[PDB]
Automatic annotation (TrEMBL), chain B:
Zn(2+) 2 binds at E57, E99, D102, D129. It comes from Ramazzottius varieornatus. Zn(2+) 1 binds at E18, E57, H60, D129. GO terms for molecular function: metal ion binding. Keywords: Metal-binding, Signal, Zinc. It comes from the Eukaryota. Disulfide bonds join C79-C169, C197-C260, C208-C228. Mg(2+) binds at E57, E99, D102, D129. SUPFAM superfamilies: Ferritin-like. This is Uncharacterized protein. InterPro entries: Ferritin-like, Ferritin-like_SF. It holds the Pfam family Ferritin_2.
Length: 275, 274
């Protein structure tokens, strides 16, 4: 009980070390003036500082709680962010918040105290508001679906690996990155998938991981010879797509034992996207 | 089995919440067009997302019905509703009010859901309603993400927040407390808020409860213009209630001393329209 709870909280602290490091640097490097030149109003820059403050609060609270439970808080890792202009700041922000929600939803499975679940659920709700904000600012629907779903710790590491240079402690190990082409679109979109590493693809299936219908398994098609996966009807919200071995894992959002490459995110088109 | 009793009671409570929300958005989408939104200074994509909220809330309702039946419970039917809507400004204010109440509804209910798998599902729906609340905040000039932590309220607290939209229920729904009027109902730390209760309760022993997600409940003796002052250290959305006595330290999860309210208070935040 306590072992699993502290392990989940330290994992969450790793997630918030990464997000708070970004927002702190971004606010130090970009001004309200920079935001207005890029299409954003004063209140949008104000909210960006508010996001920074919220994420520093998430980090600090986790540190304090881990210490109060007798644990040893993970230190920050070393990070790198692919930032050029303000549009890239918004894209990085959206990417981080879109990964941190399934991080929280997965971690909450392992937290075995009612009071700690209430605190962590409360921060998840805050991160969901962040994600809606950055969606709206980048022309995406802020609320594209009814349910956000979980991913495992290693899955989150896979989403975050481009930003993490190294960690001084054994952080969750990522899977190879799965490139998706295109990375957004509506139901029926044929998505070409390529893996960053030469994994064995015998028996590899597409896992479409959706908040509202769970894991949907499909045999990959062909495009180059790249594997393809096709977005099925009925999914809503943000999707994660991964290669998995076999189909004995019924719920890949909570079970990475068969994961081979990915997941990566796919921004499903929704009512609310810019027109 | 106690765990399963508590779980079913929480889910049927959330179904009452989602019957109300889905009834609102289904009617509102039927009564407003993109042209209405455009004339009021909004965009096509804002109307599109409004339709998406309706779809999302219909999904929340239908999911709770399916799960309650799968657990052998009997789903609560809809209550009967009325919504004070005549223009775009009112339809957005009602929307924001509903989503601001439905988040602490989910947060309180999750305390009583005793299955890991059902918590994951219900938490995911809470995440969705948090996105709704952010959207309606932004459209009404409020910060979409005003704080780090959203907090819970009890079932009866949520009934209190929703009572103006509920005409009657055909089953014993949570009973509201009298409404607590707040004036002003928004502002920064230090704002002095005049509080008036809809009924003539005994105010001997009554304290102001300031309920925050990041700090819990802050108790304070009411002032005289009854008033409550927004204290330092709070972040995000607040709820203010009258409580009797000082024995309840966490009002968000304990309504045994509540005597009027809560009502919401939109604490100022970075991201408000300037």
């Amino acid at each position: 009980k306590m072992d699993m709870t502290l392990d989940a909280l330290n994992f969450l602290l790793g997630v918030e070390h990464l997000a708070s490091a970004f927002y702190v640097q971004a606010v130090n490097n970009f001004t309200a003036d920079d935001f207005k030149a890029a299409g954003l109003a004063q209140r949008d820059y104000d909210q960006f500082v508010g996001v920074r403050n919220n994420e520093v609060d998430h980090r600090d609270t986790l540190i304090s709680v881990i210490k109060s439970l007798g644990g040893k808080p993970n230190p920050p890792c070393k990070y790198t962010f692919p930032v050029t202009d303000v549009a890239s700041v918004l894209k990085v922000s959206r990417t981080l918040e879109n990964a941190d929600k399934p991080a929280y939803l997965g971690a909450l499975r392992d937290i075995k105290s009612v009071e700690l679940r209430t605190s962590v659920q409360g921060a998840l709700s805050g991160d969901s508001a962040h994600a809606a904000f950055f969606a709206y600012l980048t022309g995406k629907a802020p609320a594209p679906g009814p349910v956000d779903g979980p991913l495992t710790q290693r899955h989150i590491a896979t989403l975050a690996q481009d930003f993490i240079v190294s960690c001084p402690y054994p952080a969750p190990k990522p899977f190879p990155k799965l490139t998706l082409s295109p990375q957004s679109g509506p139901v029926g979109t044929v998505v070409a998938t390529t893996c960053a590493q030469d994994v064995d693809t015998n028996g590899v299936m597409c896992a479409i991981i959706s908040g509202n219908q769970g894991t949907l398994m499909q045999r990959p098609g062909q495009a180059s010879g790249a594997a393809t996966c096709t977005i099925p009807p009925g999914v809503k919200g943000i999707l994660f797509i991964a290669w998995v071995r076999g189909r004995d894992v019924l719920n890949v959002g909570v079970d990475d034992s068969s994961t081979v490459c990915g997941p990566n995110y796919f921004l499903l088109s929704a009512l609310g996207d810019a027109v």
